[PDB]
């Protein structure tokens, strides 16, 4: 409780205030995003073969018994698909072919050669168009106590769907038959650089080829280039098409009208608000000379950029430069067209991840971070401005009760006096509850509670495996155990 004189104290003077941060410069643009192509190349082929079946029948006294049924597929030759099947819708009743290094000849019904009409097969639900010649199997007539042979030749034409995967050196048919030739092989137009596993006399091309439909009989109007390959089981025909305009190893995934591009040091950051994704690329562009069989990219990007620009950015924006290409992390190729508003005109294979969730977690983290740092940056500016503004009131309250102001500022109960700054040295009944009024402004902030995220899947890996009807591993394990369950593979005689 003393006077004052020696020790003197001054108030801190207004502090420099944090400045509103610079802000991010986004380039607006149009983007199309490409992913790895997983779907095979699909094309239409026609199979041309003959079911040849010979039966051996023993004739008892009251019964007859098959002693053997030999079944074989025989290819129709090139001259018969051109001069009989396509010309007249007909097929010769004789199969002449090479099976086991021998020319075998089979006559239908063991009768002389006849041209037999191809007629539509019986209707099945999810099948394609097929045509055949005979409905019945020929068996020999009964004469007693003999073995007799009987031959059936059924000429079958069916239109099948064909599938090929990268590097497009083979293709499959819907029957399950591998063809070890590229779909794009040929003798014309530089197509001989492709892969074939067959001898050259098995493959022919026909220009000016006119399909005659086996049902309607109408010859086609536009000619085609017809490939024809004679495999040892069948002849397949398909229309030739060049490889590069018909194959792309990269598939269009998303078209986005509003793609913002930002600078992230050594990298670009490409964000979408519609997809709620953001991708990270390098600043240097990806060259389209690096993508193997990638001719679809620049064509499908340019077709989608100008369609979006004429529906969204026609009179409000202008393009800047040509389309730019960037390889994002996770295996996404982003084609990007930069834009600018009308008020401001002064080889390898890309492998794409199955999960895009890193880009959606990157969007949602950045969209919260930018809001929280903006709002808390304003509270930091407004707090420094308010504390520098209350010094005016502290300089006037100091001259009224110096004892109370120096005790609130120094830290301990201090008696005070001034000369230009504070000189300061250290220092009934009852009625505890009088009516009270608050000079305080309340502020009730609560905490964000702890949340727990459980594992959640819509379909598990076990549910996706048994979604199909037939498991090939499970059917081959059951069928190869047939001898071990019903026979004796050990005992002789």
């Amino acid at each position: 409780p003393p006077p004052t004189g020696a020790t003197v104290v001054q108030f801190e003077q207004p502090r420099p205030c944090p400045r509103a941060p610079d802000g991010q410069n986004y380039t607006e643009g149009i983007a199309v995003i490409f992913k790895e192509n997983i779907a095979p190349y699909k094309f239409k082929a026609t199979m041309y073969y003959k079911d040849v079946t010979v039966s051996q029948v023993w004739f008892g006294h009251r019964y007859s018994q098959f002693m053997g049924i030999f079944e074989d597929r025989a290819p129709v030759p090139f001259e018969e698909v051109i001069d009989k099947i396509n010309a007249r819708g007909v097929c010769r009743s004789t199969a002449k072919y090479v099976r086991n290094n021998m020319e075998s000849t089979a006559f239908h019904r063991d009768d002389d050669e006849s041209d037999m009409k191809l007629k539509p097969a019986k209707a099945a639900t999810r099948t394609s168009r097929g045509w055949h010649t005979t409905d019945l199997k020929y068996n020999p007539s009964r004469i007693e106590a003999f073995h007799r042979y009987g031959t059936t030749v059924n000429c079958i034409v069916e239109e099948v769907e064909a599938r090929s995967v990268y590097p497009y050196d083979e293709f499959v048919l819907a029957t399950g038959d591998f063809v070890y030739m590229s779909p794009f092989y040929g003798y014309r137009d530089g197509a001989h650089a492709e892969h074939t596993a067959y001898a050259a006399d098995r493959f022919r091309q026909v220009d000016g080829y006119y399909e005659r439909d086996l049902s309607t009989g109408r010859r086609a109007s536009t000619p085609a280039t017809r490939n024809l390959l004679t495999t040892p089981k069948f002849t397949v025909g398909w229309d030739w098409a060049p490889k590069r305009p018909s194959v792309c190893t990269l598939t269009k995934w998303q078209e986005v009208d509003e793609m913002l591009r930002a600078e992230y040091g050594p990298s670009f950051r490409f964000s979408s608000s519609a997809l709620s994704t953001t991708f990270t690329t390098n600043r240097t562009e990806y060259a389209l000379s690096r993508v193997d069989l990638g001719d679809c990219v620049g064509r499908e990007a340019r077709e989608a950029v100008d369609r979006i620009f004429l529906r969204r950015y026609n009179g409000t924006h202008v393009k800047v430069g040509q389309v730019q290409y960037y390889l994002a992390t996770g295996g996404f190729l982003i084609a990007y067209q930069p834009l600018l508003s009308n008020a401001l005109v002064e080889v390898e294979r890309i492998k794409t991840t199955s999960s895009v969730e890193f880009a959606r977690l990157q969007f949602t983290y950045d969209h919260i971070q930018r809001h929280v740092n903006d709002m808390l940056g304003r509270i930091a500016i407004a707090w420094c401005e308010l504390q520098n503004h209350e010094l005016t009131l502290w300089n006037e309250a100091r001259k009224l009760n110096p004892n109370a102001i120096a005790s609130a500022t120094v830290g301990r109960r201090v008696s005070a006096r001034m000369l230009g700054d504070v000189m300061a040295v250290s220092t009934q009944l009852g009625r505890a509850d009088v009516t009270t009024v608050s000079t305080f402004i309340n502020l009730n902030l609560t905490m964000l509670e702890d949340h727990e995220f459980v594992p959640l899947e819509v379909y598990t890996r076990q549910e996706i495996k048994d979604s199909g009807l037939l498991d090939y591993t499970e059917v081959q394990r059951r069928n190869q155990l047939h001898a071990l369950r019903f026979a004796d593979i050990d005992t002789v005689i």
Partner: antibody, heavy 122, light 107 residues
Framework: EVQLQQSGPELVKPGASVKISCKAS????????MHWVKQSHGKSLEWIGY????????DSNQKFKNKATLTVDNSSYTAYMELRSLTSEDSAVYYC???????????????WGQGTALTVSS | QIVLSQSPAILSASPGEKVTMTCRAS?????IYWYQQKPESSPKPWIY???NLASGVPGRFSGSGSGTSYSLTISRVEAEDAATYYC?????????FGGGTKLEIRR
């Protein structure tokens, strides 16, 4: 034996039109294409085009898209070639040649006509 | 428009020795063909499918090659071999022939 009998010599004025015939015998005419080649004096062989007598499909050289048109008389088994707007550079020997109606390793010009000497002068 | 550059344009050969021709193509062709022509006569098929001999040509003739490089060899040249030999392609439109090699014999 396979024989391709061709028209013969023909002198022709400039601007006129001429029609060369190639007659076939010894083989079935409908399942072989019929080609035409040009050989100028002291020069090499230039291809013109062909025609399939069965399908009337015509593939041709685009250097001769205004000069040559091709047609087939199915009854007489003869192939024709009509040269239009004859200038001086059309003076050459023209041959007709047999070729398969497909493309394989075998598909070559196995039989040739004797030629026709065509002179555009006055 | 496949040019078929063919060398040498003239080839002298004493009867009995082996000689060779060349046919270079501007791009790769599936097969090269060969045709001989004697003066005031039609061309004749000589070698098809780059190696297969035609109907009635002697066994002293042989061909080889693939892609853009092709050759025509004679094992022991005779006096009846003096002709003009054309290489030919049909892989692109239009069909094109070569300029021609001419065998002279040195008696």
């Amino acid at each position: 034996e396979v024989q391709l009998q061709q028209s013969g010599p023909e002198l022709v004025k400039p601007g006129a039109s001429v029609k060369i015939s190639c007659k076939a015998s010894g083989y079935t005419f409908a399942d072989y294409t019929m080609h035409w080649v040009k050989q100028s004096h002291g020069k090499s062989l230039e291809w013109i085009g062909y025609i399939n007598p069965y399908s009337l499909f015509i593939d041709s050289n685009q250097k001769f898209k205004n000069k040559a048109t091709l047609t087939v008389d199915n009854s007489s088994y003869t192939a024709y070639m009509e040269l239009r707007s004859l200038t001086s550079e059309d003076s050459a020997v023209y041959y007709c040649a047999r070729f398969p109606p497909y493309y394989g390793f075998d598909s070559h010009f196995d039989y040739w006509g004797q030629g026709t000497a065509l002179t555009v002068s006055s | 428009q496949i040019v078929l550059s063919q060398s040498p344009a003239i080839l002298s050969a004493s009867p009995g020795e082996k000689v060779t021709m060349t046919c270079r193509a501007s791009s790769s062709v599936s097969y090269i063909y060969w045709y001989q022509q004697k003066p005031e006569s039609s061309p004749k098929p000589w070698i098809y499918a780059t190696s297969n001999l035609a109907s009635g040509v002697p066994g002293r003739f042989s061909g080889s090659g693939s892609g853009t490089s092709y050759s025509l060899t004679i094992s022991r040249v005779e006096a009846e071999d003096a002709a003009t030999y054309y290489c030919q392609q049909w892989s692109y439109n239009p069909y094109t022939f070569g300029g021609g090699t001419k065998l002279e014999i040195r008696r």
